Amino acid sequence: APYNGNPFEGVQLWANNYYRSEVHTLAIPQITDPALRAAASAVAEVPSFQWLDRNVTVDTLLVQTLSEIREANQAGANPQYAAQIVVYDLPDRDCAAAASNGEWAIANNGVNNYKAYINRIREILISFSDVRTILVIEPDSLANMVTNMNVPKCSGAASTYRELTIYALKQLDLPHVAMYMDAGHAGWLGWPANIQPAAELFAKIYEDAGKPRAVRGLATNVANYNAWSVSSPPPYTSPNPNYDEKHYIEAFRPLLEARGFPAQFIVDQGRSGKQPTGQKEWGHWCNAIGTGFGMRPTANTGHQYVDAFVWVKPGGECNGTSDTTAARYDYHCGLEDALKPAPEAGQWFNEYFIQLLRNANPPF
Numbered sequence: 001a002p003y004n005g006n007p008f009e010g011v012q013l014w015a016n017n018y019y020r021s022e023v024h025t026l027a028i029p030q031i032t033d034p035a036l037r038a039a040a041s042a043v044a045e046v047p048s049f050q051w052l053d054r055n056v057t058v059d060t061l062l063v064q065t066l067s068e069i070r071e072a073n074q075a076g077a078n079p080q081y082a083a084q085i086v087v088y089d090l091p092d093r094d095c096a097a098a099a100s101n102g103e104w105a106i107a108n109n110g111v112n113n114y115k116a117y118i119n120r121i122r123e124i125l126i127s128f129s130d131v132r133t134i135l136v137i138e139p140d141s142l143a144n145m146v147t148n149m150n151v152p153k154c155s156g157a158a159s160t161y162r163e164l165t166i167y168a169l170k171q172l173d174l175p176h177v178a179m180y181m182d183a184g185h186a187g188w189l190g191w192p193a194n195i196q197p198a199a200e201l202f203a204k205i206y207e208d209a210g211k212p213r214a215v216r217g218l219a220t221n222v223a224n225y226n227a228w229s230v231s232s233p234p235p236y237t238s239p240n241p242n243y244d245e246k247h248y249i250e251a252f253r254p255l256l257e258a259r260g261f262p263a264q265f266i267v268d269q270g271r272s273g274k275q276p277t278g279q280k281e282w283g284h285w286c287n288a289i290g291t292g293f294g295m296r297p298t299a300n301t302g303h304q305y306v307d308a309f310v311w312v313k314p315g316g317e318c319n320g321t322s323d324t325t326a327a328r329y330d331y332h333c334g335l336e337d338a339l340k341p342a343p344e345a346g347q348w349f350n351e352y353f354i355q356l357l358r359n360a361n362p363p364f
């Protein structure tokens, strides 16, 4: 069914069974403290995004989640449930990273692979038109075109990133869908030197895709730890005047809007409840210590440019291994402020889940 306006209005957000199963089968059996067990049970009910970060998730997880939401809705959920999905499988993924877990390469049929993936997602979303579906498009993609064009892999991938982003925006432009393109975070694109070039890029992409109706705007702070709004700059932010997501968005939106894209925002707060964090530097993104579960997902943001506070990166799923000998080891995961020992990316990291619970704000 179609919708008008903020896609988070008029619906409840579904808490998916993948994250719920992680908490109940992997986390809780390792927790003996009664209060931490009850807190863990509560966090399993908080609705976070489900990531299509490997092709095999499309005909498994996506179908299962949509099917379960349809069942719940037909069983009288009121308001009806909506889905929250991340599209995250560009070829030559994460072009500026030390290592990437992306499965596809431009040199090994990756363009065709990606187009087919988007096409299959489109078929499934059409099947499940009755389930309003909110998408984050490709974290750690186009932000690289703003600041990392000096990196050979990024320069070589840029036309592909742009073309395939446009492809997804047009193919997924369906009446029951909303899309938010990833736009980095305050400590990446929010630096004053980067903010106008970033606005130029995202507004051009939006134009070149034909300003698809389903595109609501941009997502920020995905898989990062930034504050929404704090009174004092965390020490690792200096001297960026845009030291939280509110400052970033308030500076960013006017530049985007003058360029034709009056973007609304969603802001990840799933690991933002403790401020400042235990990061020693802003660019230390992997399994950062001293972080907490943050404000609960809601459409009631109170801010004119923010459609929702969300939990995009699910807390407890590892950002990368601390094993320096692993094939896809990223040195960020070995830093002094990265919790260790850490399993492979995507594996449940229970010590990190417990950290998030202990530092949760609001508490569980």
Ligand SMILES: *[C@@H]1O[C@H](CO)[C@@H](O)[C@H](O)[C@H]1NC(C)=O
Pocket: 055, 056, 058, 059, 113, 116, 117, 120
């Ligand atoms: C991706 O998964 C689909 C099924 O959803 C399958 O048909 C296709 O072959 C897979 N892609 C690749 C490149 O293996």
Ligand SMILES: [Ca+2]
Pocket: 236, 280, 281
């Ligand atoms: Ca510093």
